[PDB]
C-alpha cells in the first residue's frame, strides 16, 4: 500500500505550505509576560486570531488548484472556513507546538479572558478529543485543506470546481489511514468526526460575538 506519484506530489505541496506556518515569538512572549487580567488575556487571544487569519490565507493560496477557482469563490471559501480552520490550528498549537507550561498559561488566560463557559467547555473538549487521535502533521495539513476546500459554503457560484479539488485530498487522507493505521479500520471515520465537530464551532462562535459590547472590529468583519 503506497501513494501514487501524483498523490505524493499533491501531498508534498500541502506539507510544504503547511510547514511554513509559525506563530511569532512576540505572541508567545506575551503569554508568558503580560498581566493576568481579562483585558490583557483577551488582547493576546485577539492577537492570536489575527495572526491565524494571515497564516490561513498564505496556506490557502498555495493549495493546488486554489488559484484556478473563480476569484469571488476564493473569498467565499476563505470566509466560509476561517472559524473552523482557526480552531483546528489552535488545537495543534495547544497540543503540539506550545511548551507544556506555555499551554497551561494560555489555558489559564483563555479561562480568564471574560469568555462564557458556554464556549470555553466545547473548545477544551474538542482539544482533548483531537489530542486523543495522536494526529500526524500530514493529517493536520490534509484535514485543514479539506476544511478550506469545502464545497458546501454559502455564496459559492461553482461547487463542482471546488469538489474537484477536495475529493483527491480526502482520497489521499483515507489512503494514509490505510497505510499508517492498518490495524485500526475506523481511523479515517475518527478524523471525519472532527470535521462535524469543527462545524458546531461556527454556531458557538457566532452567538459568542453577539454577547460582546471585548468588541474587535477587524475580527467581526472576517467572522460576520
Amino acid at each position: 500500500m503506497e501513494l501514487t506519484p501524483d498523490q505524493q506530489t499533491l501531498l508534498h505541496f500541502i506539507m510544504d505550505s503547511y510547514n511554513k506556518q509559525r506563530m511569532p515569538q512576540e505572541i508567545t512572549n506575551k503569554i508568558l509576560k503580560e498581566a493576568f487580567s481579562a483585558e490583557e488575556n483577551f488582547l493576546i487571544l485577539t492577537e492570536m486570531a489575527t495572526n491565524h487569519v494571515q497564516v490561513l490565507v498564505e496556506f490557502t493560496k498555495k493549495l493546488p488548484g486554489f488559484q484556478t477557482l473563480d476569484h469571488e469563490d476564493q473569498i467565499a471559501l476563505l470566509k466560509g472556513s476561517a472559524v473552523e480552520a482557526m480552531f483546528l490550528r489552535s488545537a495543534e498549537i495547544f497540543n503540539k507546538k506550545l511548551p507544556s507550561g506555555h499551554s497551561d498559561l494560555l489555558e489559564a488566560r483563555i479561562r480568564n479572558s471574560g469568555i462564557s463557559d458556554e464556549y470555553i467547555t466545547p473548545m477544551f473538549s474538542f482539544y482533548k478529543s483531537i489530542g486523543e487521535l495522536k494526529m500526524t502533521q500530514e493529517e493536520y495539513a490534509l484535514l485543514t485543506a479539506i476544511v478550506i476546500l469545502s464545497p458546501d459554503r454559502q455564496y459559492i457560484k461553482d461547487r463542482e470546481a471546488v469538489e474537484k479539488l477536495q475529493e483527491p485530498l480526502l482520497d489521499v487522507l483515507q489512503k494514509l489511514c490505510k497505510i499508517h493505521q492498518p490495524e485500526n479500520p475506523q481511523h479515517f471515520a475518527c478524523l471525519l468526526g472532527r470535521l462535524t465537530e469543527l462545524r458546531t464551532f461556527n454556531h458557538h462562535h457566532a452567538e459568542m460575538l453577539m454577547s460582546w459590547r471585548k468588541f474587535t472590529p477587524l475580527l467581526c468583519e472576517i467572522w460576520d
Partner: peptide, 13 residues
C-alpha cells in the same frame, strides 16, 4: 460582501 482585509491578503504578491 466587501471583506477588504481578506481581499488584500489574497491578492498580495
Amino acid at each position: 460582501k466587501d471583506h477588504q482585509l481578506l481581499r488584500y491578503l489574497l491578492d498580495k504578491d
